[PDB]
Amino acid sequence: SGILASPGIAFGKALLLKEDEIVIDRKKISADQVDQEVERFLSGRAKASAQLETIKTKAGETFGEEKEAIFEGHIMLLEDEELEQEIIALIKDKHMTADAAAHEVIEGQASALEELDDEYLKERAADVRDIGKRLLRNILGLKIIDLSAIQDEVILVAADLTPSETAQLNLKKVLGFITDAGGRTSHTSIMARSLELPAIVGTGSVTSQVKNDDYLILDAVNNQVYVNPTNEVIDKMRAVQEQVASE
Amino acid sequence: ISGILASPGIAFGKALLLKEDEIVIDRKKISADQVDQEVERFLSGRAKASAQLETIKTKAGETFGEEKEAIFEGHIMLLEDEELEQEIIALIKDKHMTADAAAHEVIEGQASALEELDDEYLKERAADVRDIGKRLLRNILGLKIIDLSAIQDEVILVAADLTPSETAQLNLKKVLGFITDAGGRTSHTSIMARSLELPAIVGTGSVTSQVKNDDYLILDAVNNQVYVNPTNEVIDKMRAVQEQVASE
Numbered sequence A: 001s002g003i004l005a006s007p008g009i010a011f012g013k014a015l016l017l018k019e020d021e022i023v024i025d026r027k028k029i030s031a032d033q034v035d036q037e038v039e040r041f042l043s044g045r046a047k048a049s050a051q052l053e054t055i056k057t058k059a060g061e062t063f064g065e066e067k068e069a070i071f072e073g074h075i076m077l078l079e080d081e082e083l084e085q086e087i088i089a090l091i092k093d094k095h096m097t098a099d100a101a102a103h104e105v106i107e108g109q110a111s112a113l114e115e116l117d118d119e120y121l122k123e124r125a126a127d128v129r130d131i132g133k134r135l136l137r138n139i140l141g142l143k144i145i146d147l148s149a150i151q152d153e154v155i156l157v158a159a160d161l162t163p164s165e166t167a168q169l170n171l172k173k174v175l176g177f178i179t180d181a182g183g184r185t186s187h188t189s190i191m192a193r194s195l196e197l198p199a200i201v202g203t204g205s206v207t208s209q210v211k212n213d214d215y216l217i218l219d220a221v222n223n224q225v226y227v228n229p230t231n232e233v234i235d236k237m238r239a240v241q242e243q244v245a246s247e
Numbered sequence B: 001i002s003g004i005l006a007s008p009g010i011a012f013g014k015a016l017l018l019k020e021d022e023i024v025i026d027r028k029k030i031s032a033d034q035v036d037q038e039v040e041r042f043l044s045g046r047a048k049a050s051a052q053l054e055t056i057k058t059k060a061g062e063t064f065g066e067e068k069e070a071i072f073e074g075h076i077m078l079l080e081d082e083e084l085e086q087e088i089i090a091l092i093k094d095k096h097m098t099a100d101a102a103a104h105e106v107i108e109g110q111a112s113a114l115e116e117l118d119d120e121y122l123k124e125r126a127a128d129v130r131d132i133g134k135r136l137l138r139n140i141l142g143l144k145i146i147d148l149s150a151i152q153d154e155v156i157l158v159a160a161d162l163t164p165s166e167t168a169q170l171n172l173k174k175v176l177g178f179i180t181d182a183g184g185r186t187s188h189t190s191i192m193a194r195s196l197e198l199p200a201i202v203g204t205g206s207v208t209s210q211v212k213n214d215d216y217l218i219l220d221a222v223n224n225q226v227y228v229n230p231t232n233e234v235i236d237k238m239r240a241v242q243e244q245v246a247s248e
Helices: A034-063 A065-078 A081-092 A098-110 A119-139 A163-168 A187-195 A231-245 B035-062 B065-079 B082-093 B099-114 B120-141 B164-168 B188-196 B232-242
Strands: A010-016 A154-157 A174-178 A215-218 A225-227 B010-017 B155-159 B175-180 B216-220 B225-228
Touching (some): A010 A174, A034 A065, A034 A098, A034 A119, A065 A119, A065 A163, A119 A163, A163 A187, A174 A215, A215 A231, B010 B175, B010 B232, B035 B065, B035 B082, B035 B099, B035 B120, B065 B164, B082 B099, B099 B120, B120 B164, B164 B188, B175 B188, B175 B216
Parallel strands (some): A010 A154, A154 A174, B010 B155
Antiparallel strands (some): A010 A215
């Protein structure tokens, strides 16, 4: 399918992003527990802040100060003295688990910027949620992504990508992006065009039509994604289309 | 609509379809008295072709510069060849073949000779020879020869494939892009489009089956699509939205 965010072709295996779904616990805790969860939260926020602190820098050296400062405000929101008061209260006051309480707050903050049909405000609620997902994972002891982990040059396949993701992404080993996105103006599109790396974004669900490690070639010229082709289809793009650089 | 996206861009316009007046050769054997009208029928027929080629020659010049106009004197030297001429007249006099079928035997045979070597350039000359062949046969057959100089309105050129003799007489200020049933990424249609910075979805199977003449359509050469008679919503979805690639 496709919307065509960025021109180019690519040959490589697909790395399929898997994001551990998040089960928030609703069960009201006992007064006994109250302390433990306040610790769960403070401990979780302690790490999520730490991961955020290395991304700031990796967004920094790669993309510079414009980007390093998107990050300063990510941290500043996660560690907001008032939002802490709110999450903790729900623990002491309404006996909610840390993972359920923090969600309520962040969710209340992201969903309050979405009231306006403002593009940028909708972009903020997006990032406000990016930060909230993080925290819950850590609180939840669920496993964290970290894209610097890259071993192979791969064609990053995912549903969508956010600034926390594309910063730690090992640029000189990702051969393009394929997402279920929205695109043409989304962060993956503007991430690619700039990088001159290919990108088809408005996909319905490549995330279901591809599996991890499947070899494939992203067309991004005529807008086609070829999953596990025959060597002649390979032989085709291989240079037939791939040699669009000569002209 | 498919296409092999030879030329990025987006166009908004009425589709100008290029219906080719069908060429139907006469394989009947004339008698020894009809022999002389045919030499005439060929000769007059050939004169039109030259009249038309020397005008294209010039148009190609003023516009596409000297490289291309020089390419036309080549079409004229072929067409007005004294031996091909002598070989066509003889098939009429000795073999009693119609002016048209005769002309076709000689030129085609001349083209075929070039295609025996899988050589991209030779295969190119062979087409170019079949180009002149078609022009000579229509003119012999007294058929309609299209003057694309004659385009008055801005439009999206919808065709089977576009020939050098065709695009040279093209009023470039009014062609808004091209969609053909073509080959693509290297076809003349494609190289042409790529220079002028005119969009092109060229590998279509048959855009000449869904697209009728005078269909307002938008050619999404950003995302490989062709919208036939788009709803006012789909229009603004590109008209502004997708169309504003130019800004970025």
